[PDB]
Design a protein around this ligand. Structure first.
Ligand SMILES: *Cc1c(COP(=O)(O)O)cnc(C)c1O
Ligand SMILES: *Cc1c(COP(=O)(O)O)cnc(C)c1O
Ligand SMILES: *Cc1c(COP(=O)(O)O)cnc(C)c1O
Ligand SMILES: *Cc1c(COP(=O)(O)O)cnc(C)c1O
Ligand SMILES: *Cc1c(COP(=O)(O)O)cnc(C)c1O
Ligand SMILES: *Cc1c(COP(=O)(O)O)cnc(C)c1O
Ligand SMILES: CC(C)CCC(=O)O
Ligand SMILES: CC(C)CCC(=O)O
Ligand SMILES: CC(C)CCC(=O)O
Ligand SMILES: CC(C)CCC(=O)O
Ligand SMILES: CC(C)CCC(=O)O
Ligand SMILES: CC(C)CCC(=O)O
Lengths: 297, 294, 297, 294, 304, 304
């Protein structure tokens, strides 16, 4: 099982064993929950949470999409997130805030169930490159599921694609949109490099990644030209490099897609430089990016 | 919810004890499957409607997610009969649920198998619809033939929109623009004496829809299955929807445009009444669809 | 100009010259009108209007799509339609009822303009086959324009396709839907015949033609098997026959599509038989179909 | 409508005489083109805003329908100035219209050329939007870059739906599910200090949109052009729309979800005010956009 | 390929001489049409299955490309019978091909008419045994969608179309499956890389609508056989999950005959092995093509 | 076609010997890849335009099909230079082609690797004069949509892809136009049957986004030239009516060079004849490919 330890449950910390909810909870039946993925990294000055405010802002934004009411002020959630790290003595960990519709009723409409229940849990936490396979499941259109939010139900699509990719022998899935263009990974944003230029994929139906945002800023600071474009699978096949970004995935080089090697078939220099600066940033070794860190101690 | 005793992975427990970890995969990623089953009071006690058909779909939904249900269908069927008996229910709604637990939180749910399972139950002018701005998911985006938890975010968004607009229910179109179904009901319309059931397209294959078609044919109605547009519904003599919870519900208006006379029509009302007679054990011809708990 | 003569204008007949409306009429700016196409044919017992009630029903149905209020009872319109034939001494003519939003205001919302203005005008009115060309304009999706109604604005799509077809040297345009399947002509429903079976195209985004309905009934009465299906352009290219139906088009055989001959390259026997029975029906020579006729005298 | 003297194919006539045959092609098939132009009162009299740009689009719209306008642009420009002068208007809305007449009623409009033309004019918290169930037409279905009469059946359906639902305006998506525009307004949103104008996609290339972008850049704002989804708007700090009739209108709520603070935002209000200063002749930098009638 | 004597635009020549210019339009632009026909040995000699239906489709495919075949259908039919006789074949696969030649290489193929035509045939190296048939084929849904009806002519066997089939088949094999299941652009099931699909549920046999698929002659044959056996057959549009929950799934094609499908996307179909309906249909189909069914003799053309 | 000596998998042979089996996978299934390269005569001998960029795309196209080209890029580059020299050509069109051979005819082409390769070249019969260029090309929007990105590989020059181009070109010519303008399935402008599109409005040059189109080398060259001349260039998605109202429209391609478009769907573009921007870009492009522009010499590979 997950070694989470003390979990913040609607205002107070309780042992993991006591962090449970009714099986009649609306979210367990209809996917009506929202969550975030946040990381803390150890630094010379103790644990530092990466871009906490941006993650909390998105958490509340996701709730708004479902017209879900979070009965806590953003500042309270931010304090709870800092405390879940402190109270458990974590240094490098993954933090998972979750807001879900409770068991007041089970009609499909979740409004009668407001306000949402909320909890925050956490647990302690390249050159070869990842191998991807294009999925037979398309990322949902923008008027089918809210792709800019981390809504629980959305991940049935990610789960189906990820299972398919792993079953096929790949590390991750690459999903296309319904029109046939590249969208993103089951849980990562995509980038590719061609003739020295870095191409970030347009937001289309993808989540607006905070890691993606961070990597674009880093890339420009390093002097690279960055263009935002729509891309096809074969534009990726012919790229010099391809890489993915995400809180859990950090910056991961992609060496092969659909059994077709990308460039030299191993992680490229651009993706590796971006990954290195990103890791230096999250560990408090880049003064120019200290604004992105929230020190727990 | 007044559920009372709930069957939890093999044994009944008080409602307050029917809880699961907040780290359960399904609570974060919508990886659960469920069913909606009804029991109606008859002269011979409570009767569950088309129990085996619902249980079959439950396991079918699980297969779509490659979810393993650690119980034989026969065991779940017994649990469903028992949730009615042990709680002393007569007319009730039964909700079986299988969900991925808290073994891990990677998006891939396979490491979380087998699924946890529970069965709960609780005693149990025409509708006005508005076409939704949310389209029912394409067949390669979400599994529309299964009752997978995550699917219902789409239904929830559409239902909230309809209610906020002043309607009773939402009518969702598919991405191409054709009529799909309600947030939780299959659709039918009637024109010049003929009953038109909508093709399955991206919709759930409703058991009530199936029941209604059989009843309609038995009553002598001509039934055709077609793809339909919103304006084919606007000009229909009648429109109605079906579902376990919705039974057979007449639709009197869509997008503020009256359907036919603007009130519940004769065909929808007749099908609803005959359906009620079937589920309450008044029609010998349909007794095969009933499972008497006593 | 059109030789219409006496035109029924909101309750009373007036000379064609007096049948005018403000240039500030909502329908002249935003396509907010509905119309019908009805024909009267000369018979041994005088002029007979074909399926009048079905056409009037559709007229009111089209108005409902626009939430347009027609300030006359269907029976009044039916009488006006009979009178436009009588008063002008017509025998074989085309009848055009039209309801349009007036000049009360020019906001895009037409509701403030209700009730609609209404008028009814009329004017006196194969083996080679028609040549069609597939259009570069797609028939509108069912959630873009109301394709089951004869709404004025809809015909911008038909006009663009028809102009294109004529410019290319064809007689009529064949429109596909956005997905690439055959839809219908700019103003006609489509049918094809293969191995003795008659295939009527599904309604999809097309208008539910009354001529199409009539031809299907006639076909079945003649003993032909009729199937309703979705079709692709190449299914038509390989058909034994292809034909179109419409009030103005009656039953018209199609001998060529996209410069590819259909079957023998001339009208086929099936389309010709259906056309003949249809013409016998509308001229009062088929006792079994007399229910479809409304004799003006 | 209090239009007064209307220019009809070359000469002004009383409003009551400005009529056309009910057998006019455009009244049956939507084959007309129009423009929306405004005149604002300035210290130097009425000034028409971006007259030549609007006249150019008028002729461009006609080309899409292969419609022949039997007058030179210069003649129409003079007619537009005169409809303001002869009626003694100061702040007014000007509506030029070209339509296919009554020569014939075959669907093909070519036999009806040249088009008839008229020019009429009349004195002239944040908006709440709801996403429409009607999608703006694909680029190969209706000519979305032209103000063709028939196109507005789509706008009318969406607007009626929005108003019936309790909103002020409709937000239409394209068939693929992305945001397109309002029933008669282009859309913008603001996030983290950056102004985002939506790409042209299937929308009309608004002159107000163009004006707003120029003003925003001149004021020092960063402006990006992107494709957007409904939930990108839900999470924006601000959303606003532009159009000749709508000027610059802030949007405080979409689908009952508040945008930012739930009230008109600073950027939208500032752009609206500077735009008003430009059209009323208070900003020398934008005088090139004005045509003084006197 | 051991084809032997090949019919080349009117006359048979040794395989070594059956070559065409590398400047042929079809080698650069996919402008060819072909057919897949089979001759099955019987006690009365080889019998070609539904020859006229295949030849009709061959000419229909050519019409889609506005390709002119400079031979009458009867001439091609005789050549098809002769390729079997002249090579002394019993059972064999027959491949007629019409392609645009090397007159020019502008994308427009009209200047290249008339098309060159050839008919070749060769023997099978091996056949699947009942054990393999019963285990059933494993399919995986492809990331490549079958082309929309206004993108490529899906009702014709046009060479270029098969780039789509090739991409899907390679993907399926690489993923460990036997065949690919392609969806259409809208997300519904279309067909395999070279087979039509069917599924069985609650006693009813469901054939998929034609949609963007090729109108298979094997599909047609199976439907006729199923109806003759007393089965109810319905034609519908289907989703991947309707197949996941079917009692049985099977595919048809000249090369594939009737092949049961036991798993799709690692999800077992029904019992996880071939079912009784597909196995029965396959048996009757094989009895028909090998001349053991008097009622279906009209479908056979005996070479001798 | 008068090609003369053709390079066939490693060595030059007379055209008559440059033939391949009619059982070649690519002749039946469109499994080939090719390039369009040009050599322009200069006072210093023939100069091949952007040779390495074309060769890179050739190998990239092969990768999409998982096709193995058994030659190093440098070998192909030498063969391309030699086909010009050995035939004594000055200006000429060069056509490299890699195709799947006749090892087997299962739809999966992997068993057929490695691919066969050839390089042929031939001279132009005629060129358009300034009069024709100024009149401009007339386009008509096609009823055939360019394939979605998950249907056919639109970034590669794969043989099968051109069935779509062939159908569109035939349709356009039959309608009386010079070329077809294809839209994508969603209704937006894609490209011509074999040319990328550009339009000019209010002084700005608009290149179309790549969408489902091929990333043209001529398109790339024109954008560089336009920027060097001082023009503002933007890349956007466009609709047919945005082109109808453009001041100018033009298309690019190796064979098409820079061709002004004066009419689309019988609607005149701007003045109804070629405009000054397209004519200027065409002139500078021609100066570049014929070695009259020192700043662009890096794009040329002199055979002598
Ligand atoms: C969370 C997530 C990402 C990555 O976003 P980050 O903010 O960089 O963590 C990408 N795609 C999906 C679908 C996600 O849920
Ligand atoms: C459960 C459900 C129905 C109704 O199906 P029944 O089997 O009749 O209860 C219809 N649509 C959806 C989306 C459903 O989930
Ligand atoms: C009127 C019309 C038809 C033909 O319908 P009928 O009822 O047979 O006259 C077909 N298509 C369109 C678009 C039409 O408007
Ligand atoms: C007229 C119009 C606009 C606004 O354009 P402006 O040039 O700014 O007046 C926006 N959308 C549509 C559909 C329009 O017709
Ligand atoms: C040839 C083919 C089939 C099978 O058709 P049969 O006539 O049964 O051989 C199925 N699908 C495709 C794409 C084909 O090319
Ligand atoms: C070859 C080609 C082009 C032109 O590209 P260039 O590199 O400029 O020759 C454009 N479109 C298609 C479809 C092509 O095949
Ligand atoms: C796809 C999501 C479950 C992963 C969030 C993260 O990157 O942390
Ligand atoms: C809306 C759905 C969750 C209701 C299921 C049922 O009809 O029982
Ligand atoms: C397309 C419509 C204008 C024609 C109606 C009719 O067939 O009479
Ligand atoms: C809704 C549109 C008709 C309004 C045009 C304008 O902004 O003037
Ligand atoms: C897909 C095709 C190449 C196969 C033809 C056949 O079944 O014989
Ligand atoms: C479309 C392609 C066949 C043309 C390549 C070229 O422009 O040379």
């Amino acid at each position: 099982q997950i070694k989470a330890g003390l979990i913040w449950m609607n205002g107070a910390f309780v042992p993991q064993e006591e962090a449970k909810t009714s099986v009649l909870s609306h979210a367990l039946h209809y996917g009506t929950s929202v969550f975030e993925g946040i990381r803390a990294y150890e630094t010379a000055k103790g644990p530092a949470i990466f871009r906490l405010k941006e993650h909390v802002k998105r958490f509340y934004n996701s709730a708004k999409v479902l017209r879900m009411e979070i009965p806590f002020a953003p500042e309270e959630l931010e304090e709870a997130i800092k405390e879940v790290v402190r109270r458990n003595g974590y240094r490098s960990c993954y933090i998972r805030p979750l807001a879900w519709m409770g068991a007041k009723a089970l009609g499909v409409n979740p409004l009668p169930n407001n306000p949402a229940e909320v909890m925050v849990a956490a647990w302690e936490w390249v050159r070869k490159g990842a191998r991807l396979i294009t999925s037979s499941w398309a990322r949902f259109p923008a008027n089918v599921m809210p792709g800019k939010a981390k809504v629980g139900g959305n991940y049935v699509n990610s789960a189906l694609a990820k299972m398919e990719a792993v079953a096929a022998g790949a590390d991750e899935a690459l999903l296309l949109d319904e029109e046939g263009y590249v969208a993103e990974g089951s849980g990562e944003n995509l980038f590719f490099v061609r003739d020295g230029v870095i191409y970030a994929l347009e937001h289309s139906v993808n989540l607006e990644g905070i890691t993606r945002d961070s990597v674009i800023r880093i890339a420009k600071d390093l002097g690279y030209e960055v263009q935002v474009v729509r891309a096809t699978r074969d534009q990726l096949y012919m790229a010099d490099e391809v890489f993915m970004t995400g809180t859990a995935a950090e910056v991961t080089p992609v060496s092969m897609i659909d059994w077709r090697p990308i460039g030299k078939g191993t992680a490229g220099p651009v993706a590796l430089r971006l990954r290195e600066v990103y890791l230096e940033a999250v560990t408090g070794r880049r003064p120019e990016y200290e604004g992105w860190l929230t020190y727990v101690n």
